[PDB]
Structures are given as structure tokens and as C-alpha cells.
Design a binder for this molecule. Structure first.
Ligand SMILES: CC(C)CN(C[C@@H](O)[C@H](Cc1ccccc1)NC(=O)O[C@H]1CO[C@H]2OCC[C@H]21)S(=O)(=O)c1ccc(N)cc1
Lengths: 99, 99
């Protein structure tokens, strides 16, 4: 699809049977999701945003379905203001900026 | 143009004859630029993301050129680590997300 930006680019994602709302975020290198349980091993990591650094749990090779499009990659889970889909997964689904 | 997300979507902008590199950022509601001393009046605001909030100044109607496309709007200015072009100005230059 083509998505204009007069509103926030919020889409429904599927991740582990759960349906969540997430923001398509071309400004994020990495996908970061709000607090949730995911299966498998994870590693403690840190990531920085506009306001400073946070602690996150890194889960590897997690599938997310983003508007019908499949992605599988590394996901970070921690105190983000909203679920954000970054460039890591936006590239997987074929996403570009056009003007 | 069509802009890939393999790398950070950095483009050249011009504001008051300052040429800067800025991020085309669909996750950002509003444009925020690195600290600079613009003329004119402003209001103080706070914006939040990963790590929490920072304090910024919102200036009134400034022309900004983004890859040769004219925009004009309020802009936020403060201690952001990167220049960020938000939806407020992405809509003005005809930017969409496509996949
Ligand atoms: C978290 C979003 C909902 C909002 N952010 C825009 C976002 O694109 C920032 C924009 C950004 C980009 C770089 C540095 C700081 C902020 N990205 C970001 O925090 O991504 C993080 C996850 O991947 C990592 O790669 C980039 C930083 C990490 S924000 O920077 O906090 C922000 C909030 C409000 C406005 N008006 C403008 C920007």
C-alpha cells in the first residue's frame, strides 16, 4: 500500500498470535516494542533515542506480520513510548519513502 | 525520488542559508532540529521518545527547503542528536511510505 503522513502511520501487526498497533518509523534503525513476553533466549542490551538510553531485551529471529507482509528478525522489547517498526524490518517488507 | 531504507534516510535541507543533513522520519509528529539560534519568537515545549523527554523551542513559520522542495512551518529546536524532518513537513513535500 501507499500511506500518506497527515496521520501517524500506525498499522496492525501480528506477533505470536497477538494483534498490536505499531508505528512505521523510518527514523528508527531498530524495531522496539513495548513490554511483552516473547519465547526463547534473549540478551540484555541498551538503545538510545531522543531522550537518552533505555534498557531493552533483545530477542533474535522473531516473525512479525506487518500489513500482510512477513518479517523475521531481531526485536527489542523495553520502555518505548509506542511499538516502533524500524528500518531493520521495513527493509524486509519492501518499504520505501517516495515524494 | 524513491528513498531506500537500507541506510538512514538522510537528505540535505536548507534553513536560513544553513545547509544541514536531516532524517526523513515518519515516526516524528513534528520537525526538530539541532540547536541553532533562529530569529523571531518561540514557545517552549517538551517532546518525548525513547529515553524520555527533552526541552525544545517552537519557532513560528520558517521556510525550509528539503531536496529542493519548499516547505514552511513551525519548527522545534533543541538538543536532539540528529536533525529530524517530521510528518508536519513530509506532508508538505509529498512524501509517502510505500511497500
Ligand atoms: C520514538 C518515536 C515514536 C518518536 N521519535 C522519532 C524516532 O524516529 C527517533 C528519531 C531519532 C533518531 C536517532 C536518534 C534519536 C532520535 N527514533 C528512535 O528513537 O529510534 C531508536 C530505535 O532505533 C535506533 O536507531 C535510531 C535511534 C534508535 S523521537 O525522536 O522521540 C521524536 C518525538 C517527537 C518529535 N516531534 C520528533 C521526534
Amino acid at each position: 500500500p501507499q500511506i500518506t503522513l497527515w496521520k501517524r502511520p500506525l498499522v496492525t501487526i501480528r506477533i505470536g498470535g497477538q494483534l498490536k498497533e505499531a508505528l512505521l518509523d523510518t527514523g528508527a534503525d531498530n524495531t522496539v516494542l513495548e513490554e511483552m513476553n516473547l519465547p526463547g533466549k534473549w540478551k540484555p542490551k541498551m538503545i538510545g533515542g531522543i531522550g537518552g538510553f533505555i534498557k531493552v531485551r533483545q530477542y533474535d529471529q522473531i516473525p512479525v506480520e506487518i500489513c500482510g507482509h512477513k518479517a523475521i528478525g531481531t526485536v527489542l522489547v523495553g520502555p518505548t513510548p509506542v511499538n516502533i517498526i524500524g528500518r531493520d524490518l521495513l527493509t524486509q517488507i519492501g518499504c520505501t519513502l517516495n515524494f
